[PDB]
Amino acid sequence: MKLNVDGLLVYFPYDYIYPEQFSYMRELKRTLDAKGHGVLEMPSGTGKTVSLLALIMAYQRAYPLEVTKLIYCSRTVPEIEKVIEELRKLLNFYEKQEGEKLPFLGLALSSRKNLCIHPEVTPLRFGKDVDGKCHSLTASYVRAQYQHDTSLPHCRFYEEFDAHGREVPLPAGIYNLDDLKALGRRQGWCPYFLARYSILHANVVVYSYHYLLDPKIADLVSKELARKAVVVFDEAHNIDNVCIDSMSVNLTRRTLDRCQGNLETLQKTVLRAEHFLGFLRRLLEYVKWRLRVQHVVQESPPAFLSGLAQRVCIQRKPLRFCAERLRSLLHTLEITDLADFSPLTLLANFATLVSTYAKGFTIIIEPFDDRTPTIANPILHFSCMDASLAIKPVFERFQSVIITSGTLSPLDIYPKILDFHPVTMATFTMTLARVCLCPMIIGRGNDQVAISSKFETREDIAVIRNYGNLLLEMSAVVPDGIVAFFTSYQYMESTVASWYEQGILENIQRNKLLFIETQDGAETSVALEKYQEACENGRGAILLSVARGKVSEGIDFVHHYGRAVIMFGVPYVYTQSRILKARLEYLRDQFQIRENDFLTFDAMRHAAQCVGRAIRGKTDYGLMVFADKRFARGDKRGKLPRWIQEHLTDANLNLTVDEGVQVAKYFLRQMAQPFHR
Amino acid sequence: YVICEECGKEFMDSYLMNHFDLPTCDNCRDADDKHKLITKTEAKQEYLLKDCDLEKREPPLKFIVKKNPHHSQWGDMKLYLKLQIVKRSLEVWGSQEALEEAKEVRQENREKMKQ
Numbered sequence: 105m106k107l108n109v110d111g112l113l114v115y116f117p118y119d120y121i122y123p124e125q126f127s128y129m130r131e132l133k134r135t136l137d138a139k140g141h142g143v144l145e146m147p148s149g150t151g152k153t154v155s156l157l158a159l160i161m162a163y164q165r166a167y168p169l170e171v172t173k174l175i176y177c178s179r180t181v182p183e184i185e186k187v188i189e190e191l192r193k194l195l196n197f198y199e200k201q202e203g204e205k206l207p208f209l210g211l212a213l214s215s216r217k218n219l220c221i222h223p224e225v226t227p228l229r230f231g232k233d234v235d236g237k238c239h240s241l242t243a244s245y246v247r248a249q250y251q252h253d254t255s256l257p258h259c260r261f262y263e264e265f266d267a268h269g270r271e272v273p274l275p276a277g278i279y280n281l282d283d284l285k286a287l288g289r290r291q292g293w294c295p296y297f298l299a300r301y302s303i304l305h306a307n308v309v310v311y312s313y314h315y316l317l318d319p320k321i322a323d324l325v326s327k328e329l330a331r332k333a334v335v336v337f338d339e340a341h342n343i344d345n346v347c348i349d350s351m352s353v354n355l356t357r358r359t360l361d362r363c364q365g366n367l368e369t370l371q372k373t374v375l376r377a378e379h380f381l382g383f384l385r386r387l388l389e390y391v392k393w394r395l396r397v398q399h400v401v402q403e404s405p406p407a408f409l410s411g412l413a414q415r416v417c418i419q420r421k422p423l424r425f426c427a428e429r430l431r432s433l434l435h436t437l438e439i440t441d442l443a444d445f446s447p448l449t450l451l452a453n454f455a456t457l458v459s460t461y462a463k464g465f466t467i468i469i470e471p472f473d474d475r476t477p478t479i480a481n482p483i484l485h486f487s488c489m490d491a492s493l494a495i496k497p498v499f500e501r502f503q504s505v506i507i508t509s510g511t512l513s514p515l516d517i518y519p520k521i522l523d524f525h526p527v528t529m530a531t532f533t534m535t536l537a538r539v540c541l542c543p544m545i546i547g548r549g550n551d552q553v554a555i556s557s558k559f560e561t562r563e564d565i566a567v568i569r570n571y572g573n574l575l576l577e578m579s580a581v582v583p584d585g586i587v588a589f590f591t592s593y594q595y596m597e598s599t600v601a602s603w604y605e606q607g608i609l610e611n612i613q614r615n616k617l618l619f620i621e622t623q624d625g626a627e628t629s630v631a632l633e634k635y636q637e638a639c640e641n642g643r644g645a646i647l648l649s650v651a652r653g654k655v656s657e658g659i660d661f662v663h664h665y666g667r668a669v670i671m672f673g674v675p676y677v678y679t680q681s682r683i684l685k686a687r688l689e690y691l692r693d694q695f696q697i698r699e700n701d702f703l704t705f706d707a708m709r710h711a712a713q714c715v716g717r718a719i720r721g722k723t724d725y726g727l728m729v730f731a732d733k734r735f736a737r738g739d740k741r742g743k744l745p746r747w748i749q750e751h752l753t754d755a756n757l758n759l760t761v762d763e764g765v766q767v768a769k770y771f772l773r774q775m776a777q778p779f780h781r
Numbered sequence: 782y783v784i785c786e787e788c789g790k791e792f793m794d795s796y797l798m799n800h801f802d803l804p805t806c807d808n809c810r811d812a813d814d815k816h817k818l819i820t821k822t823e824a825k826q827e828y829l830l831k832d833c834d835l836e837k838r839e840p841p842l843k844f845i846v847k848k849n850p851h852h853s854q855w856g857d858m859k860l861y862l863k864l865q866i867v868k869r870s871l872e873v874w875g876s877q878e879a880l881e882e883a884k885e886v887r888q889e890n891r892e893k894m895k896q
């Protein structure tokens with residue numbers, strides 16, 4: 105309804121507003137009035153978007169000049185479609201409660217493969233070739249040659265959009281990605297091109313994080329759209345990880361083999377300017393020097409360019425021209441397709457990065473491979489070390505950058521992990537008619553022996569028996585879905601092997617079905633598919649996976665799915681590969697970040713993120729356990745989000761397996777009774 | 782520009798200014814004796830200073846998180862400027878004689894408790 109905030113009225117589709125929603129609206133209004141950045145933390149995946157959009161629309165109506173463009177970057181495409189449909193529902197509610205339309209446009213952005221109408225490119229599963237084929241079908245040279253109307257198969261959506269779609273705007277009517285595709289196919293236009301034309305004349309727009317963190321595409325998609333704009337990154341608990349991965353590249357034997365294979369074709373095309381023709385010829389052999397050198401690690405971010413001017417004696421100046429060479433030399437060469445050409449492109453990007461960005465970076469070479477370490481594998485990876493580089497451009501181009509997710513417990517580490525000036529420090533804890541979660545930390549087992557997943561005790565027989573023993577009675581108290589996360593696959597495979605060797609794993613089998621998540625995506629999908637139907641009926645199942653895996657955050661455990669989430673030990677990232685330690689050293693002498701605290705912060709962030717996916721919706725409920733005494737310490741409990749801290753009573757912090765079962769039985773028994781909305 | 786309190790030469794950026802807000806250039810940085818860095822626990826034991834006195838009494842005292850020169854077992858020790866710690870201890874306890882009396886009565890109480 106018409107919620108009356110201290111200086112505005114905001115229409116809300118839902119008549120009932122929770123106190124958490126009202127407090128969040130108050131905080132967001134205060135932040136907008138402060139004209140500054142901020143950080144937010146809410147535990148509701150649903151219901152946050154509607155309130156955010158309602159307050160954004162109210163602020164735009166009240167202050168059209170203060171706010172002009174809104175960005176709602178998310179992590180995946182399902183988030184984009186759900187926020188789009190929520191915005192559509194909000195617009196329908198506003199229309200039915202007000203009676204007149206408004207000139208608001210809302211569009212969703214995705215990749216070329218997602219937004220395309222040609223049936224000759226949809227079936228293929230090459231994400232790096234769809235853009236190249238689209239460029240080959242239509243480009244500047246295609247437009248130039250279309251005047252003569254040459255008879256050749258090519259895309260014609262742009263050839264009609266440039267004459268028809270560049271005049272008629274879309275002042276009203278928010279269009280989803282499927283709606284945009286339908287409009288493009290009925291008007292003979294490309295959805296991507298019409299989106300690129302209509303972003304300027306639009307009210308809101310949604311897309312992924314990669315369109316802003318990546319400097320090679322953020323400028324193209326957002327250069328002078330709006331100096332004063334509001335951007336929000338919902339579900340950005342791992343924003344630092346993606347920011348680091350944005351400027352992270354890898355090299356292997358396949359890349360260099362592809363480059364040496366395609367340079368011959370490039371030379372053959374050329375022989376049919378000269379400053380770069382011979383420039384790239386001797387670049388491949390410089391990095392192949394490390395191929396013949398058998399060394400553990402070489403670190404020299406400043407001296408890497410200095411050493412380049414020794415073997416071949418090339419100045420640093422031409423390296424910066426590689427970025428602009430792509431749009432000049434390549435388009436004149438008329439490359440048929442990006443196939444067998446992508447590794448060549450990243451080499452130019454790699455050269456520009458080392459030449460320009462070397463203050464907070466480090467070059468790492470590691471000749472180690474899984475189960476075949478020393479055969480042949482000199483791996484060069486320009487791993488980033490500072491997360492501020494990927495976030496600096498957006499902070500100076502925007503005024504009210506907001507970071508929010510379901511797990512942002514430490515609000516004092518994000519402003520120092522990346523250069524930030526928070527003025528909010530706001531946390532919210534959801535409340536219902538009953539406690540929907542029962543977090544508890546299990547310490548010593550029934551034998552009064554700690555079950556901590558310590559590195560020196562991974563092979564211990566006493567601890568591994570308790571882990572199976574804990575899962576035994578737990579499988580018989582919480583039905584239809586239990587999700588268990590392990591530290592790593594190597595620890596996971598050794599865990600089940602010990603259980604299989606003993607006569608204990610078979611007892612779990614007759615209660616619930618044991619499903620193991622593997623690295624293969626196809627095998628994971630079918631395993632998840634049978635898990636969903638196993639929990640659908642009364643047979644039940646157990647989902648075993650890893651905390652740092654694609655399945656931990658790729659799926660959401662809605663109610664009746666995964667009623668219990670089990671964390672077998674504190675998930676600590678492996679210290680090998682000499683990558684994390686490089687980041688630890690950089691943060692040590694730059695941001696004064698404690699090495700132990702950052703590892704604890706990273707360990708608890710992933711642990712709290714995955715365990716927080718069992719509560720989606722007010723009516724949803726679930727069980728949360730921690731199979732490690734290390735969680736019981738105050739330094740790690742404080743790293744849990746505030747909406748879980750108050751429900752984690754001090755009575756159950758070191759209780760045994762048998763005590764934990766009794767708490768679970770009591771909690772689930774009283775949570776099945778009917779309630780009121 | 783910041784004027785050094787030792788030499789008087791103006792400087793823009795220096796290690797002491799960056800890490801402890803000390804108006805002293807790197808040329809006059811006597812990190813050997815005058816600007817020696819000590820661990821937090823050592824300072825607390827010697828000067829009988831509490832955490833709040835090192836974190837909440839204005840002005841707050843900065844520190845450098847430096848990895849221990851020994852093994853990587855558990856380093857990342859916090860180091861504070863000796864001059865700032867001495868000044869804070871003198872401000873809290875009034876005089877050095879008061880601090881000496883405090884440590885003497887503390888060790889006397891420790892002996893009393895153990896006996």
Ligand code: SF4
Binds near residue numbers: 294
């Ligand atoms: S221009 Fe649009 S419709 Fe044509 S191939 Fe490219 S993405 Fe597909």
Ligand SMILES: [Zn+2]
Binds near residue numbers: 786805806807808
């Ligand atoms: Zn001086």
